[PDB]
Amino acid sequence: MSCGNEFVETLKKIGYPKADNLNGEDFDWLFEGVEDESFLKWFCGNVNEQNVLSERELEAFSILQKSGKPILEGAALDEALKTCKTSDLKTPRLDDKELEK
Amino acid sequence: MELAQEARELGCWAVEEMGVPVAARAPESTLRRLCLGQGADIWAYILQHVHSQRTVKKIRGNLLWYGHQDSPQVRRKLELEAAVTRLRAEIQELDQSL
């Protein structure tokens, strides 16, 4: 069984630009070691596209870190996410007529 | 120098960030053998574009809440409210002088 196919799929999940030009058989030398495989199976079967951020998000968070603002981690992150998900419904904000009033 | 440095950074990124177990951890010789050849760059991608789930949720929530807060529309609404505050304060002060 070509074990490098799952690695190719995983590297396609992380949005690698050159992952389409990489073959599974060209990286079969990676998967031939047992100590290699101990990390390779977990990387293939426990990493998805949700663990990966885009370049725009990365540079925006870099500018945010350079801005010195506190980073929402833990409870503040959960509070912000809960407020945004509750605001994902019908919200009457951003009205330009009340702005004109 | 880049091979061993990338191998050690990859090991630290596997341990600290993803929480890779010790039995599933890549040893130093494993990281050196993976990173030689074409593996020096692609895992160099993974250490800078791939994070843990908690870190990705952290960055996404931080951006999606602060950019909502730092929108110029929110700023113009806030400064119009502050303008209303300054205006009736000016009303009180001018009426006091009157």
Curated annotation (Swiss-Prot), chain A:
Disulfide bonds: none
Cell location: Cytoplasm, Cytoskeleton, Microtubule organizing center, Centrosome; Cytoplasm, Cytoskeleton, Spindle
Domain of life: Eukaryota
Chain positions found as N-acetylserine: 2
Transmembrane segments: none
Description of how the protein assembles with itself and partners: Component of the HAUS augmin-like complex. The complex interacts with the gamma-tubulin ring complex and this interaction is required for spindle assembly. Interacts with EML3 (phosphorylated at 'Thr-881').
Role noted for this protein: Contributes to mitotic spindle assembly, maintenance of centrosome integrity and completion of cytokinesis as part of the HAUS augmin-like complex.
Family: Belongs to the HAUS3 family.
Name used for this protein in its record: HAUS augmin-like complex subunit 3
Record organism: Homo sapiens (Human)
Curated annotation (Swiss-Prot), chain B:
Positions of modified residues (Phosphoserine): 71
Subcellular location: Cytoplasm, Cytoskeleton, Microtubule organizing center, Centrosome; Cytoplasm, Cytoskeleton, Spindle
Transmembrane segments: none
List of residues that carry N-acetylmethionine: 1
Coiled coil (UniProt feature): 73-98
Function: Contributes to mitotic spindle assembly, maintenance of centrosome integrity and completion of cytokinesis as part of the HAUS augmin-like complex.
Family statement: Belongs to the HAUS5 family.
Subunit: Component of the HAUS augmin-like complex. The complex interacts with the gamma-tubulin ring complex and this interaction is required for spindle assembly. Interacts with EML3 (phosphorylated at 'Thr-881').
Name this protein carries in UniProt: HAUS augmin-like complex subunit 5
Gene symbol of the encoding locus: HAUS5
Residues of the full protein shown: 1 to 98 of 633
